[PDB]
Amino acid sequence: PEARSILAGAAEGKVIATTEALSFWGGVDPATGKVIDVHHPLHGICLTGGVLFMPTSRGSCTGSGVLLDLILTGRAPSALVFCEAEDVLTLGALVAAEMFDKALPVIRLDTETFARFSRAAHVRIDQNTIKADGVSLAVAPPATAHLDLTDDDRAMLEGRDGIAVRQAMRIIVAMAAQQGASALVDVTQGHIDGCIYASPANLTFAEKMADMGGKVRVPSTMNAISVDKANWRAQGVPEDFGDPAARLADAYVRMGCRPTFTCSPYLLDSAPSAGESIGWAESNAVIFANTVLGARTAKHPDFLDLCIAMTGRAPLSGVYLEENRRPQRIVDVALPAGIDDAFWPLVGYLAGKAVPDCIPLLRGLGAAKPSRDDLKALCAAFGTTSASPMLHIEGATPEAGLAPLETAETVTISLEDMAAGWSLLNEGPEEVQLVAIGSPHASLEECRALAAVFNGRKRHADVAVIVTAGQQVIDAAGKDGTLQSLKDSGVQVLPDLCWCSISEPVFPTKTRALMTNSGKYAHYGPGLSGRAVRFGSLADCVESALTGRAVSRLPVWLS
Ligand code: FES
Ligand SMILES: [Mg+2]
C-alpha cells in the first residue's frame, strides 16, 4: 500500500467514489458543484465537501478553472484522490494554493488501496496521513523537484524577470515535480484555452496574471471564447455575461495572445510542423497536434498554458518524450461496409471509453481512408472520454508505425459497442429545433461538405442551423462562395463561439432538442444546454434541418 501527497492540505468528508474519470468542465456545474455529465455514473450528485475518488480526470483542459471556481466559492470537494497520473485538476488546486490562498489536498494511491478506500464512508487527510474509516495510511510528502534547469530558467524562477514570470515558473516546476520529470523543454508556440468564460475564476485568474505583468514570450493563439467578439452586444447577449466574457478574451489579448478565438488552431497558417515542440491546451487541439500533425505537446491544463507561454518552457514529460508516444494499448476496430462521416467521431468516443488513460493504436481502419476532417472529429470525441493527449490510427496517422510497448494489451471495438454508443448519444426525441455543427470549429472543407449536402435546399423555418468556426475559415468561406451558399439555405455561421461556449440567446431559447454531428458536443451537449441531444451524420443533420425531424434509427453501417 502506497499513498503519495501531490498537493498538501487538510480535509475530511464523506467518500464520493467512481471508477470512471470525470471532466470538471462540462461535467461539473460551478454554480452548484453537481455532476452534469449525463453519461457519468455520478450524474446529479453534489460533490461539495466530499472526498472524491476517481482513477484520474478525463476530457477538458478547462477543468482547472472550474475546480478553481469551486474552491473559491466553497462548492468544491474537500479533497481529490486518484490512482493514476493527473494534471488538470491537480493544476487547478495548485493555482489555488499558489495564487488564491486556498489549499485543496490531492493524493495518489495505488490501485488496490484506491479500490479499498473507495468503499469507505469517510476519509480524513492531513499532511502525513490519509485515513479511511479510521484506517490510517502514511502519505509520502510531495516529490522533490530533480529538474535540470538552464541559467535562464533559474533567472525566471529567482524573479529577475519579474514576479509574474516567477509565478509561472513556480507552477511549471511544481507540475514537473509531480510528474517526475527531470528537465524542461522549449516550446515554439502556445495555444491558450482558459479564455472560455467557464467560471468567474477564469476571468479572475486572467486579470490577476495580467495585472501581475504577465505577457507571452512565444507566439500564442487563443481557443474559442464565450462571446461573438464583434457582435455579442447586438445579438442580445446579457451584459452580465457578455461583459466578463469579453474582458476575459481582452485580458489574454493584452498579454500578447493572438485573437484567433478558435478551437481548431491546427487549421491556421501558424500550425506547427511534424516533430515541433509546442505548448497547447484545448483537448482536441492537443490530440490533433500529436496524432495527425506529429507535433509534440502534453495536454496542458488551462492556466498552465499561459505559464508555459510566458516562459517558453514546459515540463519534459509525457508525449514530449518519444518513448511515451509508443502505442500503449492495441484496439482492433470493426470496419463495417457503408460507413459515413459519423463513424469517425463515434469510434473516437468509444476508443476513449475503451482506453481512457493511455495511448491507443487503432487497427483495421486504414483502408477506409479517413479525411483530415474525419481525423479531426475522431480526435475531438476521443478527448471527451480519455485523458491521453494522443492516439494512433494504423494506415492514417504519421507515427502509427511506432513500435507498441512490448506488453501492450489488445481490446476491440465491436459492432455491438458501436450500436450501444450510438444509442447512448441519441437519447432525445425525433423533432429537433436546432442543428449544431462545428465542435471543434469547422474546417473550410467541412463547410463546403455541408453546403454540398444541402444542395441549395432551404432549412425548415422551425429548425435553426448553426455552424461555429474560426474567423479565418469564415473569411475563406466568404471568398470562395461557401458562406453565401450556406446563408442561402438559412444556415448561420458564427465566429469565436463554439458549442462548448455558446449561450442564450445565440443558442436559440426555443430549442428543446438538437441534433449534432459532433461526438464531443453529443456528449457534453445535454449537461451544457439542458436540451435533449441527438447525434448523427452530416446528412442526418441536413435532413433534420429540412424536415424538422431526425429519424431515430441505427445508421446503415450498424443495421
Ligand atoms: S471550444 Fe470545445 S471543441 Fe470548440
Ligand atoms: Mg474534452
Author numbering: 11 to 569
Sentences from the paper on this structure:
Aconitase superfamily members catalyze the homologous isomerization of specific substrates by sequential dehydration and hydration and contain a [4Fe-4S] cluster. However, monomeric and heterodimeric types of function unknown aconitase X (AcnX) have recently been characterized as a cis-3-hydroxy-L-proline dehydratase (AcnXType-I) and mevalonate 5-phosphate dehydratase (AcnXType-II), respectively. We herein elucidated the crystal structures of AcnXType-I from Agrobacterium tumefaciens (AtAcnX) and AcnXType-II from Thermococcus kodakarensis (TkAcnX) without a ligand and in complex with substrates. AtAcnX and TkAcnX contained the [2Fe-2S] and [3Fe-4S] clusters, respectively, conforming to UV and EPR spectroscopy analyses.
The crystal structure was elucidated by the single-wavelength anomalous dispersion (SAD) method using the selenomethionine (SeMet)-substituted crystal, and subsequently refined to a resolution of 1.6 Å against the data set from the native crystal. The three molecules in the asymmetric unit were essentially identical, being superimposable with a root-mean-square deviation (r.m.s.d.) of 0.4–0.7 Å over 552–558 Cα atoms. Alternatively, we attempted to separately superimpose each domain of mAcn onto the crystal structure of AtAcnX, and found that domains 1–4 of AtAcnX each consisted of 157–336, 337–435, 436–569, and 1–149 residues in the order of 4-1-2-3, respectively, from the N to C terminus. AtAcnX crystals were brown in color, similar to the purified protein, strongly indicating the maintenance of cofactors. The electron density map suggested that this enzyme had a planar [2Fe-2S] cluster (gray mesh in Fig. 4a) located within a solvent-filled cleft in the protein structure. Fe2 and Fe1 atoms were tetrahedrally coordinated by two bridging sulfide ions and two cysteine residues (Cys273 and Cys508) and by two bridging sulfide ions, one water molecule, and one cysteine (Cys510), respectively. The water molecule further formed hydrogen bonds with the side chains of Glu292 and Lys530. The superpositions of the overall crystal structures showed that the [2Fe-2S] cluster in AtAcnX was roughly located at a similar position to the [4Fe-4S] cluster in mAcn. Among the [Fe-S] cluster-binding sites, only two adjacent Cys508 (green) and Cys510 (blue) in AtAcnX were located at equivalent (or close) positions to Cys421 and Cys424 in mAcn; the characteristic motifs of Cys-X-Cys and Cys-X-X-Cys were often detected in other [Fe-S] cluster-containing proteins. On the other hand, AtAcnX possessed Cys273 (yellow-green) at an equivalent position to His147 in mAcn, whereas no homologous cysteine residues to Cys358 were found in mAcn.
